[PDB]
């Protein structure tokens, strides 16, 4: 595609520049080009890929929620009819969001996941697969159940690997649990599962902190505080 003539290293260099300039659409396009070179990604490169698309899809999701709220209010008793424009524009934003999710899922399927053998990369990519199916689920209204189950299945494979191959304080394991817990709470209508997962994850990490350096301790406790914040919110 458009990045096919640029060196892999130049794409990564430009992705880092785009991040500094808060140009996340550019950043995502550069990292897509880097993935399409066909080589596996390093730890730093995987995080550039995720940062880029998380920011792009984050803005789209926030816009979709604003528009969906306006649309719902327009269907309340006593709302003046304003025509098709709200629905049309919500659909436009929805379609662009789905396209981004499809692009990320396509990169994971061709061929990031199948080449990823180490626990750190495989779990990272399967968490991403679960995350982007979850974003598809947020806007889904015949295929909603299958979209939900695709998210669940990706998260579950990642959980299984992370519990076997990673310590309980591993930041990827913790963030995977954080997100799968939110999936349970607000996608799968399973708040009790969400709370159980967050509390167990928190407690098992707490008990492993003593093994860590100062820097690793800061990394793990940062994510543990996100789990605690969610538990406080939900209980």
């Amino acid at each position: 595609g458009a990045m096919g003539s640029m060196e892999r290293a130049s794409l990564i260099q430009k992705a880092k520049l785009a991040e500094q300039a808060e140009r996340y659409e550019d950043m995502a396009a550069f990292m897509k080009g880097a993935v399409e070179k066909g080589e596996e990604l390093s730890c730093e490169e995987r995080n550039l890929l995720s940062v880029a698309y998380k920011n792009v899809v984050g803005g789209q999701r926030a816009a979709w929620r604003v528009l969906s709220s306006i649309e719902q209010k327009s269907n309340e008793e006593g709302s003046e009819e304003k025509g098709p424009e709200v629905r049309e524009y919500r659909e436009k934003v929805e379609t662009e969001l789905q396209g981004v999710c499809d692009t990320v899922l396509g990169l994971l399927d061709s061929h990031l996941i199948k080449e990823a053998g180490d626990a750190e990369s495989r779990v990272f990519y399967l968490k991403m697969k679960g995350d982007y199916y979850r974003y598809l689920a947020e806007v889904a209204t015949d295929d909603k159940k299958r979209i939900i189950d695709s998210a669940r299945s990706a998260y579950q494979e990642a959980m299984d690997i992370s519990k076997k191959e990673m310590p309980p304080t591993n930041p990827i394991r913790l963030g995977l649990a954080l997100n799968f817990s939110v999936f349970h709470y607000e996608i799968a209508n399973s708040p009790e599962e969400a709370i159980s997962l967050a509390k167990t994850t928190f407690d098992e990490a707490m008990a492993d902190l003593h093994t860590l350096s100062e820097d690793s301790y800061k990394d793990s406790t940062l994510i543990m505080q996100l789990l605690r914040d969610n538990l406080t919110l939900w209980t």
Binding site: V182, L226, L233
Partner: peptide, 6 residues
């Protein structure tokens, strides 16, 4: 306050 994902 909104729940966290990362």
């Amino acid at each position: 306050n909104e729940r966290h994902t990362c």
